[PDB]
Design a protein around this ligand. Sequence first.
Ligand code: SRP
Ligand code: SRP
Lengths: 469, 465
Amino acid sequence: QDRNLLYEHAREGYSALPLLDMESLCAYPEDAARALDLRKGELRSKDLPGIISTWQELRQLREQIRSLEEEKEAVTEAVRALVVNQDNSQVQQDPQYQSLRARGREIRKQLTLLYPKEAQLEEQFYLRALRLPNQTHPDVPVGDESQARVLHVVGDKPAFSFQPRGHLEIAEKLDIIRQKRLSHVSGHRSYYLRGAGALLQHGLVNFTLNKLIHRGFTPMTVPDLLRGVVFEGCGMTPNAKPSQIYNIDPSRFEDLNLAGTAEVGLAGYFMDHSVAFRDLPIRMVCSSTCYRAETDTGKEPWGLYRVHHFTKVEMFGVTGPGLEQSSELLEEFLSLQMEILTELGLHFRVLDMPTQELGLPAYRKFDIEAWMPGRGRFGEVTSASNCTDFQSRRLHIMFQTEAGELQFAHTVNATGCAVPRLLIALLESYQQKDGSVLVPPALQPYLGTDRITTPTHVPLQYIGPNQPQ
Amino acid sequence: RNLLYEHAREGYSALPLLDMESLCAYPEDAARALDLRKGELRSKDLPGIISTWQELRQLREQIRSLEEEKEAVTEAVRALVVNQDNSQVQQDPQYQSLRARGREIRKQLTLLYPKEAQLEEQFYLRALRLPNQTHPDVPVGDESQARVLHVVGDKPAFSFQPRGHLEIAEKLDIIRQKRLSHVSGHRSYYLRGAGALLQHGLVNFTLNKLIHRGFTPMTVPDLLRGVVFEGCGMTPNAKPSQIYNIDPSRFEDLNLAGTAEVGLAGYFMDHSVAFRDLPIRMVCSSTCYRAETDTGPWGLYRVHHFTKVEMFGVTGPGLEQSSELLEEFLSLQMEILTELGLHFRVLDMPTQELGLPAYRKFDIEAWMPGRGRFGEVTSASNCTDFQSRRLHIMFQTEAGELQFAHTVNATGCAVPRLLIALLESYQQKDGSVLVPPALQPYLGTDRITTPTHVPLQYIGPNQPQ
Ligand SMILES: Nc1ncnc2c1ncn2[C@@H]1O[C@H](COP(=O)(O)OC(=O)[C@@H](N)CO)[C@@H](O)[C@H]1O
Ligand SMILES: Nc1ncnc2c1ncn2[C@@H]1O[C@H](COP(=O)(O)OC(=O)[C@@H](N)CO)[C@@H](O)[C@H]1O
């Protein structure tokens, strides 16, 4: 179905309709069309005129409706004013019986038709307008992913005296990651972390949480299962065709979906509420389990590069009246990501993402790719996006001055630490010839050792039927 | 259909190996034990189950005899042809007699094979619904018959009427549940500030303690196939299931676990561990999801999502080992709750409250002043070989033979109700909440007070103004 969750949500009266800045769009349609085309998303410049026109038609329809409503209360007076005036038996057939009372039922007849038309026009507008992307920062590089601009390169490739191995091989030998023999247990791409592997995840998560909490971020825990409206509000797609979002059985539980990032739950917390101006900027940090269907995306059958479940610590910000505040907060979040990766001793590159890779909600987006020796490639480990007022206008995330005046806040989100790919980068960058893996000083307090070595336990032995004999 | 049987039908694993010889040997003891649990099956069902099993063994013997006779016939034919050395052997009365019996045998087998598959399924579909054995000392009866084994601490004294955790938390803005119906649904919540620090602290305090006591930390998938749940003694298909399943029309056989116990069992499934490593002690922190359709609207006592650190064990050749491990897990739970400064009581759960997989089950209830009663905060169960026989969780003996291991599970710390007990036990008259020394390193304070931020204000259309 093409039913928009934000619109349906509003239709039921659960929240108000999203408040889009049509004044700006109608004032500068040419600029909007050009930026729209450069994103190469669903909607293109050819679609804009129709969207603007539907909005304009709706505005006039509402003007016509109001006009007819006011006129009805004017005709109701042509009768009310005549209940104690010549109301013997004259009014029942006076010259003002027809033409001044028959035009009262004609108005009712019209309004009964216009109200439904208004609803139809309104849905027509939102179904399309809500698929329009956010504006684009003037400095965003134009083009596909390959056009990303390298802003910083930190460190250099680790040098080995042997061919670096992949993280899965390294981990299986140390029995800290397991993916084999799980198709009928937990499915493809699923995995278990054991011993030092689990300690590595706990260490990464706690190192990151500790750092951010110490830096003034408010810790939060959010629901993992959320209604589709929240995803739509964030600029995600609960159900495009192959959808990245897992949904709970609709025949058993109504509208429940697993989030692919704590960003969803965090946005849901602020939905329909206002924060105090004095508290801006609001900085929050949240660790949660993320779920992603990963359909039609990169083929990564083995290894932790594109898994269905993983833990991620998320940074989320709600700020000021405008761009200066949100742009600065994005810069702050990025600097924190760089600090985390630098302290982990990883080689990485910071990228200014191009127009076709911003998505729908992003105005500006900075990603960081970490060098992964075994994979032999730079791989994205974090993303940071300034969504300006795209999410706030859809989910009504406001800020309030001391006086009570409400304005749309801006929202910013950024990866604090996504475990899977950091495990890849760490295991592959710190691997030793003998198969052991050195532990970065920053994580040693969590690992209780400076080197991960072969375990004492005997690895599990498969005793099932599906084996050669 | 039974997920365990289907799983085997597809050849993904062998069929569960139930201890029928023990059952058939002492059907009377099993009969009374079954009735005392007052579960699905009762004494009036054992005779049928035992009969089907016997009919199945006989059918298999009959099939074996026929398959063996078929070979004997084929050999008699080969020997006849070689012995007669004639171009017209087909016309020999004996040759035709053997060939006829050969075709008859094959016909009879075409009848027995389908019957065998049928009986086998009928047996498992019913036999798999039988509970584990029951420990001799288990108290008989319903929950009211739970036996108090020990009590630790004393009820806190207040100079005022203790308030409930939600009121306390909303005032401090550390828990939110209001206006979430269309965001995350009923019985969902957010923890903020000190509230989130409390969860972080509880989880880390428990994880650190257990890791330092020798438990191997683990991370498990949260989405698993139905077979693993069934193997643990849970019910993904009991119509009103407490297990959330991913939309079947989009993704096949994927379910959210209500405890890391499921994933941990899935790890050992179809594998064998070395005897020298027993007992295997693992600890795992995971997000748990429970539909709680049966019953429950406000408060954290019964929610749909929560974080829980789980203890899981795989041990020795028999009962002595699994029993001692359960005791070990219980003692650890008591240490954790005592160090958090909570008042609690240990219970030996009764026959009707063991469920299907448990042989022995100890629960701990913590005093919750605001609630005005004790509430279960942990459970610990010895499942002996109930899960292992269903998921083939083995161990290799000294001699080098495979035997079914025993599994044990226990709550390390379940956050929701611990928050209730902590908030309600340490609340102060002015609304602040004192922090237990053990949790102070994680909270950075000895007292949780009113937050600095201005609480969020609802600005939606559904309000008077
Ligand atoms: N299938 C998968 N397997 C392994 N790692 C994956 C993954 N999908 C995403 N990630 C990791 O999570 C980080 C997040 O995602 P993005 O989805 O880019 O950001 C957001 O979610 C924003 N809320 C900021 O974090 C990525 O940069 C990547 O390292
Ligand atoms: N809906 C809910 N809301 C809040 N807390 C809940 C809950 N369902 C269960 N719990 C908490 O998690 C612990 C777990 O469960 P049980 O299901 O008893 O055990 C097992 O799972 C075994 N694997 C041992 O932990 C319980 O003792 C209880 O404190």
